[PDB]
Amino acid sequence: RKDCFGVFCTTYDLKSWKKLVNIAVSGAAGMISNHLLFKLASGEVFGQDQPIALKLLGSERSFQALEGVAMELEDSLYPLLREVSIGIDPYEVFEDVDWALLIGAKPRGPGMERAALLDINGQIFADQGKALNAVASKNVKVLVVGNPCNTNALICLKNAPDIPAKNFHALTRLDENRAKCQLALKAGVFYDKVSNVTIWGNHSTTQVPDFLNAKIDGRPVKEVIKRTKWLEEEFTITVQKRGGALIQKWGRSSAASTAVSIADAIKSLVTPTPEGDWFSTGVYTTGNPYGIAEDIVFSMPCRSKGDGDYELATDVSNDDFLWERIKKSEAELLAEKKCVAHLTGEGNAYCDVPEDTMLP
Amino acid sequence: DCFGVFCTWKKLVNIAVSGAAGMISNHLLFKLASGEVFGQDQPIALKLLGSERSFQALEGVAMELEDSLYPLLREVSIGIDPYEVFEDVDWALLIGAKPRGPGMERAALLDINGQIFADQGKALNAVASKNVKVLVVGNPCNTNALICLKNAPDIPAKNFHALTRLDENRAKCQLALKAGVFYDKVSNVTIWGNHSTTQVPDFLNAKIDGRPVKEVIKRTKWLEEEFTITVQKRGGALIQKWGRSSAASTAVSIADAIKSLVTPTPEGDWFSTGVYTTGNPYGIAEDIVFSMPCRSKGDGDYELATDVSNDDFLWERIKKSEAELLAEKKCVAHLTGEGNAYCDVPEDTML
Ligand SMILES: [Zn+2]
Ligand SMILES: [Zn+2]
Ligand SMILES: [Zn+2]
Ligand SMILES: [Zn+2]
Ligand SMILES: [Zn+2]
Ligand SMILES: [Zn+2]
Ligand SMILES: [Zn+2]
Ligand SMILES: [Zn+2]
Ligand SMILES: [Zn+2]
Incomplete structure (x- = not known):
């Protein structure tokens, strides 16, 4: 079993709840994610009758922190959060997700021209776009928060021709x-x-x-x-x-x-x-x-x-x-x-x- | 008592939160404001208490709240004085407490924090609702709660929690x-x-x-x-x-x-x-x-x-x-x- 974390490995869909919705989250070990994941788990976002699964994407450098987040979720006992998985490979974290909250993105570094930021983060989204096209649901909604949003989203959807362009958001x-x-x-x-x-x-x-x-x-x-x-x-x-x-x-x-x-x-x-x-x-x-x-x-x-x-x-x-x-x-x-x-x-x-x- | 845009269903319930600029509060306040805590039919009011040393941090959180547009959050105010922030509060979430300082013996912490809750206990007694529920998180919790209720005789010893x-x-x-x-x-x-x-x-x-x-x-x-x-x-x-x-x-x-x-x-x-x-x-x-x-x-x-x-x-x-x-x-x-x-x-x- 390599698709589940801690106590979340013990669940399976208990067929007035709606079918489980899968949500991927990049920049999962970040500050925004730290506030967002718990709102989602509580059902405030999708409603009290919508159980969910959280697929958290982090990085080799932040994998530790990513484990910490999953553990805090274990200790939150949210009954609507049926599944949790963590990883650093988007081709894995993204399989079958219905939502992709793309928060991950390199911060604007010192003396880093607008062009370099566009290329560095663009590359990241070009790949995530390919991952989504290959393994995610064909009707996945992709919400881009990583800067620069608009262009990252354009790049992402352009690298996922099999996903309606309409499904991408900045x-x-x-x-x-x-x-x-x-x-x-x-x-x-x-x-x-x-x-x-x-x-x-x-x-x-x-x-x-x-x-x-x-x-x-x-x-x-x-x-x-x-x-x-x-x-x-x-x-x-x-x-x-x-x-x-x-x-x-x-x-x-x-x-x-x-x-x-x-x-x-x-x-x-x-x-x-x-x-x-x-x-x-x-x-x-x-x-x-x-x-x-x-x-x-x-x-x-x-x-x-x-x-x-x-x-x-x-x-x-x-x-x-x-x-x-x-x-x-x-x-x-x-x-x-x-x-x-x-x-x-x-x-x-x-x-x-x-x-x-x-x-700013 | 209001802040920013806040200067403008069941009966409104007032909540006081100490250590309001702390990390825990930064997560809690929004859960309270969204209504996941007291329910979608319970409008609330947040009275945020912090240390003067963190007043700017207090403003920041209040500002994030204005930007959150929570419709259940009808009032928000901040301050550094318990006799002020605690007026009419139905709930008092006391997270505020001094952390275990450098080479600080358990006894020192007890006195320092115990002195803080003794004073907050008095403020609550003096201005908070007579049936105010008090939840303590500031360590030591148990002993701080005890000290707090001993200093708030006009409030049921029953209502204090660690x-x-x-x-x-x-x-x-x-x-x-x-x-x-x-x-x-x-x-x-x-x-x-x-x-x-x-x-x-x-x-x-x-x-x-x-x-x-x-x-x-x-x-x-x-x-x-x-x-x-x-x-x-x-x-x-x-x-x-x-x-x-x-x-x-x-x-x-x-x-x-x-x-x-x-x-x-x-x-x-x-x-x-x-x-x-x-x-x-x-x-x-x-x-x-x-x-x-x-x-x-x-x-x-x-x-x-x-x-x-x-x-x-x-x-x-x-x-x-x-x-x-x-x-x-x-x-x-x-x-x-x-x-x-x-x-x-x-x-x-x-x-
Ligand atoms: Zn499953
Ligand atoms: Zn699939
Ligand atoms: Zn953006
Ligand atoms: Zn902005
Ligand atoms: Zn004009
Ligand atoms: Zn007042
Ligand atoms: Zn503990
Ligand atoms: Zn405690
Ligand atoms: Zn005694």
Whole structure:
């Protein structure tokens, strides 16, 4: 038996629970994973009637730590967590998974240009993409959190032609949640009265917090928040500096709240979207009606029936102020894309990307 | 009392958490906010207490909470003053405590922390709800809880708890493993005594899928010598792998501890918790906090379990732990109102 860990080796499916769902998690020994795995195990993410299996992918260097995590899960006695496995080979960890939470990625190293980060992490996702294509479920949902998200996702799906491109996601939910918080604060209202908050573009400094389509208590934010300057200059920067402001305050990563956002991101795919609302997710653009370039992964407004899939939200309004920001982010993504042409199999690479675009 | 966007279904319940900027809290607070602890129909309010030395860390967590958008979390506030943070609180999760300093004798820790809970005990008495449930995690737990309730006379000595649930959960896991059964088939597991190397994992009363453990696990050599030790050294086995504290799992145990108080205990089962022992039926010393088996109707309180058998193997261990507790108690008499203090406590007993 080499597919189970400790006490989890003793289970098997006990045929009102739904069939076991398999979830792979890269960067499994990381800080975000340390907060996320327990939320999943408790059933808060997929619901109380959904038992699950956790396939944790780590590395040779962090395998020890990976064992520590599995042991803490053993001591948590979560009744919905029926299976746990750990490993360093994605062709193994990924077999039969229905979800792939790809958090693993090399941090932006000292004096490491944007291009090198695109190539180093791109290679990692190109391989994980092949692993998923060979051993994972043909309908696996792949949620990318490892930076740079959008382009890593493009690379991943391009290396998994047998998996619908539509199934790949670059998470912008944390930034959506922060934008909504900032909006709520500004309008002096609680965050449960804010909706239709969209983050367009790639997960970087060019991301677009869209206030035009947002609502506060059912009304367009523009009629509630009159301060146009804040909306067009302060809002975005406030969102953009939140992660960085939490670095000096907290001292380190804001793991807890990003794990919360990853959970929300998943729930948005497995629960029907409340009428009129939507959620943000970096997704394959081919076919989009927003006039955005095709063949890339761009965060856009989406809603879901709760079947694990989604559709782009059409009841969206667009003005030049939004359009321009959307095309600017689009351009950065087209530049990133060409820069990884080798990994996508597009042909030959050409890199000319901005250096200070990494969201703090 | 509000923070950030928070400056703007059953009756709201207020929760106070000390050591709020600590690693355990960093996991626990979000479990509480999401509603996995008190349920999806229980809106809550978090009162976060931390040390001034960690106020910035406190802000960070509060900020992460605003960014989490938990709809059940209606209020959040932070501060460094117990008389402030504890006002109207229904629950007080006391995780805050000074770690065993460099070359610090067990007696020093007792005084330093005991002095902290004595003061928090007074703050609770003065401003917290009169029926506030107090769960202690700051070590020493038992002795800190005892000191806390002695300093809060207007609050039922009944409501004070020293958490051992983590050790019970670990015990249940080790029993499930050894018996080749899943951990959800193990029950009636009790951790007796003090939260320390003197704790007593009770296998005599332990059950596995409805039948006594001794009826499934035949390796007696194990039960009698290994079992208790594996549990006792689980925290150490985790620090060698993970690298640091096991915040995540203990946060889960704390959530469980609370749920055993607000959820009807399953028939015939019970949960471990260090509590006031005066009316105890097991013949264990009184006027102290000892971990015993309890059950509850899920109304916030509990009652001891009488459907427990004992033997000399078990009872002897329960006494050695009792001896340690009495020693700790005398050592902090100046904080309980027991007159003068006398310290003759063991050094290496820390889990
Ligand atoms: Zn299975
Ligand atoms: Zn397969
Ligand atoms: Zn990203
Ligand atoms: Zn971000
Ligand atoms: Zn304008
Ligand atoms: Zn106040
Ligand atoms: Zn303790
Ligand atoms: Zn312990
Ligand atoms: Zn006494």
